[PDB]
Amino acid sequence: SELSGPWRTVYIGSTNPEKIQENGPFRTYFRELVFDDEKGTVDFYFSVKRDGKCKNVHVKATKQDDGTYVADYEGQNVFKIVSLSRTHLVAHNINVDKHGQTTELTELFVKGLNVEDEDLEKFWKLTEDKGIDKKNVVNFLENEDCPHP
Ligand SMILES: C=C(CCCC)CCC(=C)CC(=O)O
Known part of the structure; x- marks a missing residue:
């Protein structure tokens, strides 16, 4: 809950490279997370480029009894937060597309001043x-390459 605020993406890894390349659905530049402990939800606010245009998107994730989360975004997503503090979030996700095809992704997001060595180590091991x-x-840190007409 005190975890809410201006999170940024550091790294995202994918078993399918095409999903995180420019114009891919999982190249998500985070701006904000809102944690609600009473509802067991996390709201994600991020920018992504699709079809040559950038949009600001909102996705709501819901915590399950087994501790994992679900969310609908470019398919169906089931994810686990493996490390969480006031300054970092490390997670892995399984995305299932409409054809049943699966992609596994890993992510590091931060809300501190710097990216700590401990943050990096957890991400790269995962x-x-x-x-x-x-x-x-x-x-x-790569340019999102949004158009400005
Ligand atoms: C799948 C991603 C990016 C999710 C963008 C909606 C990275 C790995 C995660 C488990 C992220 C997450 O859902 O926190």
Whole structure:
């Protein structure tokens, strides 16, 4: 709940590179998370480029009894937060598309001044553990390349 505020994306890894390349659905630049402990929800606010245009998107995730979350976005998503504090969030997600095809993703998001070594280590271990190659991780300091007509 004190966890709500201006989160930013650091890295996202994918088993399918096409999903996180420019114009891909999972190239999500976070702006804000809102945690609601009484409802067991997390609201995500982020920008993503699709079909050559940038949109500000909102997705609501709901905590399950087993501790994992579900959310509908570009398919159906089931995810686990593996590490969470006032300054970092490390998570892995399974996305299921309309054809039953699955993509596994890993993510590091932060709300502190810096990215701590401890943050990075958890992210990179998880990414290796899920079989994600280093070339299939995106660095979100890259230009989103939004048009400005
Ligand atoms: C799948 C992603 C990005 C989600 C963008 C909607 C990274 C790994 C996660 C488990 C993220 C998450 O849902 O917190």
